[PDB]
Amino acid sequence: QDTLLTLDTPAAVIDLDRMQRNIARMQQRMDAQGVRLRPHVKTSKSVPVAAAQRAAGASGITVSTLKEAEQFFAAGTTDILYAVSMAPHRLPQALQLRRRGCDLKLIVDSVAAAQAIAAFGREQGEAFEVWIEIDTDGHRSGVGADDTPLLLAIGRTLHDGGMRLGGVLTHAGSSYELDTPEALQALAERERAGCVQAAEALRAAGLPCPVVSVGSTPTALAASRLDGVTEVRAGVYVFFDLVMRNIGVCAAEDVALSVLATVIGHQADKGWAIVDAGWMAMSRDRGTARQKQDFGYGQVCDLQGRVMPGFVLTGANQEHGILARADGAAEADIATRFPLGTRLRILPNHACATGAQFPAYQALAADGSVQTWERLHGW
Amino acid sequence: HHHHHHAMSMQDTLLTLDTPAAVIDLDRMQRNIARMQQRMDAQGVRLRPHVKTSKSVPVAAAQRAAGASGITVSTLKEAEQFFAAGTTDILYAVSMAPHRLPQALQLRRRGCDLKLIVDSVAAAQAIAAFGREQGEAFEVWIEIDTDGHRSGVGADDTPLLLAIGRTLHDGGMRLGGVLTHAGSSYELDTPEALQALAERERAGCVQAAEALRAAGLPCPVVSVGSTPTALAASRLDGVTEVRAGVYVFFDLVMRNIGVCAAEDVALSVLATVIGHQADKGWAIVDAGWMAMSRDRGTARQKQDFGYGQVCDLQGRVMPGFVLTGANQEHGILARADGAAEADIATRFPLGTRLRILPNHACATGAQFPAYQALAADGSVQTWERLHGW
Numbered sequence: 001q002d003t004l005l006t007l008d009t010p011a012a013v014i015d016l017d018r019m020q021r022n023i024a025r026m027q028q029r030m031d032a033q034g035v036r037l038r039p040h041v042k043t044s045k046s047v048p049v050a051a052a053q054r055a056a057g058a059s060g061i062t063v064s065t066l067k068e069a070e071q072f073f074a075a076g077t078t079d080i081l082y083a084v085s086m087a088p089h090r091l092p093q094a095l096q097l098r099r100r101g102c103d104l105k106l107i108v109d110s111v112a113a114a115q116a117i118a119a120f121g122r123e124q125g126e127a128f129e130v131w132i133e134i135d136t137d138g139h140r141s142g143v144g145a146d147d148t149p150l151l152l153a154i155g156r157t158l159h160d161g162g163m164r165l166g167g168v169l170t171h172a173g174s175s176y177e178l179d180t181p182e183a184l185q186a187l188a189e190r191e192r193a194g195c196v197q198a199a200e201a202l203r204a205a206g207l208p209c210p211v212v213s214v215g216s217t218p219t220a221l222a223a224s225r226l227d228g229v230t231e232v233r234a235g236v237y238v239f240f241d242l243v244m245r246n247i248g249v250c251a252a253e254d255v256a257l258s259v260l261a262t263v264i265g266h267q268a269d270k271g272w273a274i275v276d277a278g279w280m281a282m283s284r285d286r287g288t289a290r291q292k293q294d295f296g297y298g299q300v301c302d303l304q305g306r307v308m309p310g311f312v313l314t315g316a317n318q319e320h321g322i323l324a325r326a327d328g329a330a331e332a333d334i335a336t337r338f339p340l341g342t343r344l345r346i347l348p349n350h351a352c353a354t355g356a357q358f359p360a361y362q363a364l365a366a367d368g369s370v371q372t373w374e375r376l377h378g379w
Numbered sequence: 380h381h382h383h384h385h386a387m388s389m390q391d392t393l394l395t396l397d398t399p400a401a402v403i404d405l406d407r408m409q410r411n412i413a414r415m416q417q418r419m420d421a422q423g424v425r426l427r428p429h430v431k432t433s434k435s436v437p438v439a440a441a442q443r444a445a446g447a448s449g450i451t452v453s454t455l456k457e458a459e460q461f462f463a464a465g466t467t468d469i470l471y472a473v474s475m476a477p478h479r480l481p482q483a484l485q486l487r488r489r490g491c492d493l494k495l496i497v498d499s500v501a502a503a504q505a506i507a508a509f510g511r512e513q514g515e516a517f518e519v520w521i522e523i524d525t526d527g528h529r530s531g532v533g534a535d536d537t538p539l540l541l542a543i544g545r546t547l548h549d550g551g552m553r554l555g556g557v558l559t560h561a562g563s564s565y566e567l568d569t570p571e572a573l574q575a576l577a578e579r580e581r582a583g584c585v586q587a588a589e590a591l592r593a594a595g596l597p598c599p600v601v602s603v604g605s606t607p608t609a610l611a612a613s614r615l616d617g618v619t620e621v622r623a624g625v626y627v628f629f630d631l632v633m634r635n636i637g638v639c640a641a642e643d644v645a646l647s648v649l650a651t652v653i654g655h656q657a658d659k660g661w662a663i664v665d666a667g668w669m670a671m672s673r674d675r676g677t678a679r680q681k682q683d684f685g686y687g688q689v690c691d692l693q694g695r696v697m698p699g700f701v702l703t704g705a706n707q708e709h710g711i712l713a714r715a716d717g718a719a720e721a722d723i724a725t726r727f728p729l730g731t732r733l734r735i736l737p738n739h740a741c742a743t744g745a746q747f748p749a750y751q752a753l754a755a756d757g758s759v760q761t762w763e764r765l766h767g768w
């Protein structure tokens with residue numbers, strides 16, 4: 001059997017017991033709120049990870065690219081939301097997916113994008129399902145939640161244009177700037193209220209709006225109530241990461257994704273251990289640098305997964321990571337503690353960024369064996 | 380003409396590719412290749428390009444055709460790929476892990492002249508014991524710390540150099556040389572500081588080789604390099620080869636260091652405008668950090684380019700517009716100066732294609748399964764590159 005001692009390094013390891021606990025926690029919270037969970041698979045892009053989310057009770061998926069829609073559809077998943085403002089040039093790709101049987105949903109936030117979809121759908125005989133993206137927190141895309149004229153103009157373009165106006169959605173991504181339950185709870189309420197208000201405005205205009213979809217992992221876990229909401233979209237929670245830990249929604253011990261690395265040398269005067277997990281393994285994401293505890297390029301754990309507080313990757317080049325004390329001191333006799341060849345596991349800043357560096361995950365079972373779970377790269 | 384007509388009908392250009400896409404401007408890439416090879420020829424040293432920037436067979440083929448001698452790789456997966464493609468002279472320039480010794484042995488047994496590096500007595504002892512067990516005289520170079528960038532034996536640490544060189548030589552391995560990488564050059568931004576660092580890198584690696592040879596140990600190769608010190612060195616006496624890699628494409632970190640212009644940057648990411656926030660002066664593009672990478676190396680340099688410098692479809696810089704933010708599949712295009720551009724939707728209409736110059740070519744390239752190699756006629760060809768280990 002393949003195990004953490006036999007793998008080459010670096011490797012992206014999923015602790016299956018931790019991932020299942022994360023999947024159960026999120027599904028149980030959504031069940032308590034009376035809403036569907038539509039996981040965002042862009043975090044893993046791996047068929048077996050999404051299958052475990054579905055087995056726990058998830059309803060459909062959210063994807064960040066049409067490549068992910070192709071992969072998951074080829075795997076038998078048909079209820080797919082492509083939650084990135086639709087580019088008109090990708091309409092042939094989307095059409096071919098729907099004609100093949102994939103119930104692929106698109107989103108827009110502009111009259112011009114809604115007109116491009118509706119005109120192509122009429123030409124091709126396709127009533128595209130399209131949701132309107134709502135900006136509830138100023139994070140990124142979307143129709144402002146009280147910009148009613150814009151909301152109604154896009155709504156009538158789709159519905160009068162013969163398309164299926166399927167719903168409204170929002171992602172309150174500014175939740176990643178927060179770090180207290182009170183602030184997260186308030187942002188989750190602003191997200192819920194803004195999305196519900198857009199749905200209510202459509203409906204008062206006699207336009208259909210059957211789905212109201214909100215979510216980010218921190219607002220999904222913090223929201224006190226979700227009246228008016230039909231589903232929540234959350235993705236990074238499947239593994240968690242150190243950014244989530246700093247936001248306050250999980251502990252380091254809950255993070256299910258780590259990078260297995262080998263010690264390949266040392267700088268004794270500086271108290272460095274050099275590992276073979278550089279930024280090509282961890283990614284360049286440094287999201288914890290802007291937070292109350294900086295973890296460098298990741299938190300060190302031993303081969304058993306025990307967190308080693310106070311050792312982090314303080315630097316990284318492409319294929320070399322620099323392990324050193326978080327307090328800045330030069331650990332004495334670093335080589336005596338971490339001899340050449342010692343294996344360690346590094347928890348990521350951002351699970352979605354680190355996962356994308358690997359062709360595959362190594363799914364670690366209770367007995368210590370691993371199975372390789374491929375994931376998708378590119379577009 | 381059946382093949383001809385069908386190929387024409389299938390041929391992509393920058394208007395027909397899906398976005399995002401990593402586009403190599405071949406004419407800029409050839410100018411970078413010629414420039415570095417001519418500089419190394421002028422210095423009388425070999426150029427051993429570091430292929431970890433592209434990990435692409437046709438890009439390394441163009442470096443070889445121009446005059447390069449061998450390659451440097453950052454992983455044994457690169458050594459496996461490039462050897463399969465016919466490159467036999469390969470330096471694996473990352474401190475050797477003992478557990479990878481079976482793979483290095485297999486590659487040498489298949490005919491790859493694969494060189495390994497160490498910087499410790501324990502790594503030397505592991506290589507020599509495995510080589511004696513397996514009947515293999517591994518070739519091993521000793522890595523030298525000349526500028527404090529990362530790791531390596533100190534150039535002035537004679538006792539440790541000798542201990543490692545003797546462990547290898549007495550152990551029946553081939554002690555083949557010393558190498559250094561003065562990566563602290565990426566913190567510099569004047570020709571004077573770069574020329575002085577290049578001289579410190581040359582002097583320190585030659586110093587180490589001279590200490591080994593003074594002890595009777597072989598050390599025929601002296602290998603130095605980073606792209607900025609390769610381009611800045613006045614003299615390379617005592618050096619046998621230079622390793623450089625990011626030069627093949629350049630990037631905005633190199634532009635800021637001062638060793639190229641933005642117009643020399645051969646790699647760009649083709650993106651489409653997919654939305655706006657008109658009141659904030661934002662255009663939203665489909666190149667987020669999954670396309671650009673999270674690399675922000677320009678953040679602390681003289682000119683911060685955010686997640687990349689915006690260029691028009693013809694690849695010309697659009698001054699003052701950069702990607703100021705990025706989420707996974709969304710980039711935020713806005714003024715670098717922090718003004719909200721008026722009429723952003725007029726400046727950048729929905730569906731507009733743009734090209735984004737990267738902070739760090741090695742980091743952006745690794746986000747793509749393949750490059751789109753752009754010829755002067757506007758045609759592109761898919762050039763696969765390696766992902767993972």
Ligand SMILES: Cc1ncc(COP(=O)(O)O)c(CN[C@@H](C(=O)O)[C@H](O)C(=O)O)c1O
Binds near residue numbers: 173707
């Ligand atoms: C449109 C949309 N919906 C849901 C999610 C899931 O959010 P998480 O559960 O918090 O992962 C996202 C996530 N988007 C990413 C991104 O990079 O775009 C986050 O904003 C982030 O990691 O910063 C989403 O876009």
Ligand SMILES: Cc1ncc(COP(=O)(O)O)c(CN[C@@H](C(=O)O)[C@H](O)C(=O)O)c1O
Binds near residue numbers: 318472606
């Ligand atoms: C051992 C070794 N040799 C040569 C090079 C090539 O340097 P460039 O020509 O400047 O790319 C490198 C490069 N190493 C990278 C890295 O990430 O490790 C650079 O230090 C960097 O991009 O920061 C090298 O490691």
Ligand SMILES: [Mg+2]
Binds near residue numbers: 173174176706
């Ligand atoms: Mg975000």
Ligand SMILES: [Mg+2]
Binds near residue numbers: 352353
């Ligand atoms: Mg994320």
Ligand SMILES: [Mg+2]
Binds near residue numbers: 565
């Ligand atoms: Mg460096």
Ligand SMILES: [Mg+2]
Binds near residue numbers: 318742
């Ligand atoms: Mg580089």
Ligand SMILES: [Mg+2]
Binds near residue numbers: 008768
């Ligand atoms: Mg392998």
